[PDB]
Amino acid sequence: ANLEGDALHTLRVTLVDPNNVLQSWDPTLVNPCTWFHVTCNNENSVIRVDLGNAELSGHLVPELGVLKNLQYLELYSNNITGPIPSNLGDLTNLVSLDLYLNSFSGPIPESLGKLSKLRFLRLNNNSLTGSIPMSLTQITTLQVLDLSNNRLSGSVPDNGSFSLFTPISFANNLDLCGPVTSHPCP
């Protein structure tokens, strides 16, 4: 409510918002549960942030990790730059992380492996570099993965939850190797 509203307001200040989709994000409200693009559970705690295809730019903030009951984070089809914040892995109840179709740079954080309830992970169409963290194989619930159209490289793991994924999850990357690609590793 107070703490969650302050995090989301810190996000608003940091984003550029030409179409005023965050007009309703009034910091004088006791909680953000009447705000547009935000959904709360019966206890007035944030469970969804739905900001897809909203012509947003700027970068995300690390204060997003205070949203402990967040289940769905949709930030897709924007022009968001900068790194995926490392402490998005503090979002222990997250089911869907949908950051696809942006200009995110730098690595996929190792911390995303701590998202033990994550089901959907769609990071495609970004400028993400480095390797795919092994810790992601240990998310038992992970069933939909798209890292395609990035600049990822190194070994693509194929154990655990990654055993389900086909080449289409990893297509058009910089330098990926392993069984799921045609190329064995260096």
Next chain:
Amino acid sequence: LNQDATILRQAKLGLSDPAQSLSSWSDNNDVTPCKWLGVSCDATSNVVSVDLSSFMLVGPFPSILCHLPSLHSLSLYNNSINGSLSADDFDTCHNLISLDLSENLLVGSIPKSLPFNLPNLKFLEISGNNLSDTIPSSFGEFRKLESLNLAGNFLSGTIPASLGNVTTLKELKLAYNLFSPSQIPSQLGNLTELQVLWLAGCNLVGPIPPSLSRLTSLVNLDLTFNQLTGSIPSWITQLKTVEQIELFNNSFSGELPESMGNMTTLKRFDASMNKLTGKIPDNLNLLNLESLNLFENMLEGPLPESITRSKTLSELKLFNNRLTGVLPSQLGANSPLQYVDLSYNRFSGEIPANVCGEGKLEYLILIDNSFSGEISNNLGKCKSLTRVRLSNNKLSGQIPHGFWGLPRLSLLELSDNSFTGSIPKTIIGAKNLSNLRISKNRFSGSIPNEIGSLNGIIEISGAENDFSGEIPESLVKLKQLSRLDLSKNQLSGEIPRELRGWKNLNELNLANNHLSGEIPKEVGILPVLNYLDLSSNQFSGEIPLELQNLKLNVLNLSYNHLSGKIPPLYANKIYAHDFIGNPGLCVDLDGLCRKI
């Protein structure tokens, strides 16, 4: 034109002037100093003041300006004057009465020699700078000072007791500084001419000193955002001329003083966000009260009738307390009520019938009480309303027709009550309505087609009602609709085939209805649809292949009459719970289709 022209131009040389705010100064035409911008004179052509407010001037403090012999006021308000002040900066300034250096980029400490150098000062403001170190104890030597504003700096240590020595003070503003934890100095009680005391965000602790009863000519007392403790003292009643008391965000406990009722001059009282217990004082006679905020405390008992004697009351916020009983039946009849929030209390009985008696009510927020009965006809005439939240009460009966069509109403939240009747045609009037929340009620009849002509609607949430008939085709005309939840109703018929209008629709929940026909193929081309619940209906035909284009988080088509092959991306085991209770569905393996 005398040394005044020379001295002013030297001062201009020391400052960077990117906006050319001083172009009249260094641009001749033989014009004398008295008609230069920001420079004012007396009858004998002596520069008596210099005001350079909001000129975007950058550079160190221009000490050369004090070489003007007749200078009385110097304002550099709202510039980028930077660096620090020093003793040498104010040597020649001994004729100054007024000095405003606020909203600049000054750093370092306040020079200790300032009172010795500026004996005639009545006004000193260095507010909104980056000053550090302690407030000098030498400030007790000021013999004429009437106003001191050092608010919004990084001043450290504690508020010096010697400031009590400066009995000429009418305004003391030290708010938002980086002081050590400390009690309000007792010596401030000696300042018997004080009208304004603003020590907000000063890291204060302990009780309000009894000394401060002697500040009898206080107008505004603001101690917000500290850690003050104890009772709000009963001697605030003896402040004969007090108009504003701001005590919110502290650790005040005990009861509000019962004597409060006779504070006839009081306009604005806020002791919200404390640990206050007991009752709101009764026998109130607050003739001039504009604002009463006591939200987020542990106040118990009723709202006394005598609040209606406050005929200029515009703001009443008592939310998040343990308040009980019926509201005064005449509340708002003879006052310009504007913002009312009584959320999260235990209020019972009827909403006062003339609460918008004077046509000024904007917020009516009564969440989570036990308000029973109906919304009166007279609230339908309240055309100033923007934010209505009545949810989680015991309210019942039909909503008056004019209430739905209020022209500025933005958020209308009636959810979780026992409201009956149909939504009338008069809702065309609500042209600013963006958020309609009417879930968990007993609303009936068709969703009227007139909702579709309200272009600015973003959420419609009307689940758990008795709505029947078809979904209006005009709901597809709503380009900015991001949530539609009409689940758990008696709706029938099919959903419109042409859906490209719903370009912002993120959530579509039509579950637990009597809906029929095909799932439209255009559902698959909605750009931001992520939550699709069409479960527990009578939908027939094939699941469109176009649904594979969607990046859904919730997909639920369970308990319908769907048949034919499952689209190949959704035939995966991981999506199988999305299609439970559709006996006719099959998984095609290229040739063989099996009912699983």
Next chain:
Amino acid sequence: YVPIPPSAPSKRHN
């Protein structure tokens, strides 16, 4: 420019 919060009533609501 440092925006110093005014000496006024809290605007919190809901």
